[PDB]
Amino acid sequence: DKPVGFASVPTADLPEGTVGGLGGEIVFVRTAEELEKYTTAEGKYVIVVDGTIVFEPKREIKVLSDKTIVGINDAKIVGGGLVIKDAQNVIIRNIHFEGFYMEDDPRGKKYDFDYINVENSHHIWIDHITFVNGNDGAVDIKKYSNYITVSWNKFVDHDKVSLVGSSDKEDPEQAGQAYKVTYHHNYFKNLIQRMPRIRFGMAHVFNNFYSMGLRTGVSGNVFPIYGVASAMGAKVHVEGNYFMGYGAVMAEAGIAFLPTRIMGPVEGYLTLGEGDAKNEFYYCKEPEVRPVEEGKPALDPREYYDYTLDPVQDVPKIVVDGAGAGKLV
């Protein structure tokens, strides 16, 4: 009912952090035209997606401020995505996104279809969504967006999962102050990269289940490459996550998922939880780390918000049981 993490952080005009269209007008939508009518409307709306909505032609629609998009009756958006642009205060929950896969574009480099594309927007909660094999990104977060929680989603069979900050060339000061994102209790399943890949900002990645089997049926990237990456001086803390790679034969040949990655050209920072906050890694390469200061978590999310960490051994069952669309009441 309320987000945990960066989406919950209060501002002047959003005293309770992200609340979407709370207090607004309730509308049920059953077609792409109806959905787009209300996501592009001005004002508070709770937009209830009832069942399957097919976008033909495939396309993305804009979403303005103060919206809740909530699915019921196994809500599906098929061949459609949401661009949240120059906006704030949007909640998206309990919908299954599928149908952006373009078999003529197996590396997701032509069509640019993202299921959720957040551009210069802040206070956004993406929760209890299932995303299945899209084209380009599943949830991308760009152009100085900020204060995002991506929680309890299930991402399946998808290559480039979540890019946070799309350009090495953005303003170091401004970008360093944006891109504050929390990823927690997500079920990441047979995915390839960017979970998240973050430039500049701050990422708290906790209590997610990474179940990295192969992406079959397709060409392009069949084997999972890496989970979390920290680039362009980002501050990332990764704790209490459970990583399972793709097995003993491959690991013995020196081929294995990389749980955390430092990337450049200006290296990011990233630390791991330890002790009660440790991650677990099975069939993985050794995680890459780079602290801001020896013995300190590169990010202290307790400076920004409260949260409780589940013991890592409990994470698989909690995440399988709870994550993705069709589980919320």
Add this chain to the structure above:
Amino acid sequence: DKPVGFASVPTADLPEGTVGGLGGEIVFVRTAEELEKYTTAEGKYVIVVDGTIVFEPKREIKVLSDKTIVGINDAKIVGGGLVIKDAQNVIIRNIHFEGFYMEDDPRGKKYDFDYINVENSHHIWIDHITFVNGNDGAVDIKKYSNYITVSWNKFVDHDKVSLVGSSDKEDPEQAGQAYKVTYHHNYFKNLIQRMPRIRFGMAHVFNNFYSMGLRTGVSGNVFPIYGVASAMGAKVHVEGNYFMGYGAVMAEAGIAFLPTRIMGPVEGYLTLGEGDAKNEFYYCKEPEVRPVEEGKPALDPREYYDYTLDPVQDVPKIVVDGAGAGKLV
């Protein structure tokens, strides 16, 4: 109608070897409660499983001596397994086991669910069963069990297939005299390990078809590792089996299924058939062998029972055509 191999070996009270509930009372079961009522009953029963039986919650049920559990009408046990404990003389045939896979436990190390778990039991025939992707073991054989035939089953998409002897620390004399198991005419399909893995005892592995493709859709072990393993001084003979691994590209990179494996800490023994009893290996590593004495089969099953060996080139078609549930009349 009668087992071949170690299940058929006569004792004082079992003059015809394994016969299950022959002569006993015939009962049809259509629920988990009814099945458990009769598998835990004292006395002779022929228990006919008619159609699908779902176990919610998932769980294993005990089976006592002198039972036949036989499926009809595409019998399925879903999310349930059978523990045959401190017992003897049990036949299980023509049932499809599925539904023990636990996606929060991709290495099968938490829940401990076995489709068939044989503990301190002997004279057990497991025949014409299909087992699909369980949790821990498909057919495990533990705690000094003995005189088992596992024949004409189809095992599919499963990681840890059949463990025979669960502890390096069992009594060398006692364990050396137990765990006499014959595995024949099984269709082993996209499986990872232990086909069987045996400690201490004696394993005759003949005329099985190993079709080792990838286990997809899952994390953990995606690539088949090894077929038969002989550990703790076990005596294993492997003859007339057809092994097909997962292809030229992998084999050329030095990555390939290992058909037979010697394991420790006290090394087992294992020999191959040759000439008319040879195995065939395609896309495999060279099999590991270790004879008890130069030029002798580490086990001579003709000292214990009669059998006829199919020519290895005939094994794929015979096994595909005949193995698994839903083929017996």
Add this chain to the structure above:
Amino acid sequence: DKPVGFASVPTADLPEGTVGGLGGEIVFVRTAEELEKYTTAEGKYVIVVDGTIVFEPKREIKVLSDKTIVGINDAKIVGGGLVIKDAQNVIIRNIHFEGFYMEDDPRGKKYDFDYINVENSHHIWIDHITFVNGNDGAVDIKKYSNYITVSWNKFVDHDKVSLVGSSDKEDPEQAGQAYKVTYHHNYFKNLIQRMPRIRFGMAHVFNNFYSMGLRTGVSGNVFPIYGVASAMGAKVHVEGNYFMGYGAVMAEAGIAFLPTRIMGPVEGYLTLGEGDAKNEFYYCKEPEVRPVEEGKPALDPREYYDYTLDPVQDVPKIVVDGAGAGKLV
């Protein structure tokens, strides 16, 4: 409506090149017996396959000269193939072949079932067909066959795709003058080898989409090995084709699809298009080449027929949208 490439080349008795049963008698067939009645009939026939035709037992049927075999209503030939032998002037279009896979023969070396087997025949057009995981070949071209176009087909999940010339021991002069084959606008999807593999003759391979993901569910060859191969002094030109292999992890371990291959024992020749006729390669090894003469295309198809080359970047979408059965009107 008319072939492009070698099938269109005029002869004395075939002034318009391949036209199949144009002008002949139209017949609708709905059973394997009816189909075989007409493919083995003498004379001109347009044979319209309406819906699914199942061959039990699985088998191949002969097709004589001057035939059009054309599917409607999602036409399927299941467990059947066509042998075009000592014949000419045959068109096959808009049918889905499936059901030759033999799981007891994962390397396709026992049963010898080909979906289309062209023997000592010429002027054959194979167009808008979908072929799914057969046994041995999908389209083999043998025994001095000649003047073939294989265009706009979709080949899926199949190991040994198209062998052109089955013997190193055929007559160098005669074979050098036969096996003139054009492969264009085919969607090659999760296939293993021979796309085509050609001995002796001349192959023009243009504007095909190679989407080389894994062949899962099966043992044998799970990883795609190589696309086009030129053997026994064949003359092959490969231009405007788009190759996508199976990803970064494998490529970084030195494991990757080989787009073009020179094979012996007498090496073939093969050249690539460049500039406006270039191919694209992603996640592939470097293509093998061997020109007849420095700076010349090993084959100049403009000496034999006219064609227009699509820009390679357009090929994936054109081929996905247009290739395979069920798309022709």
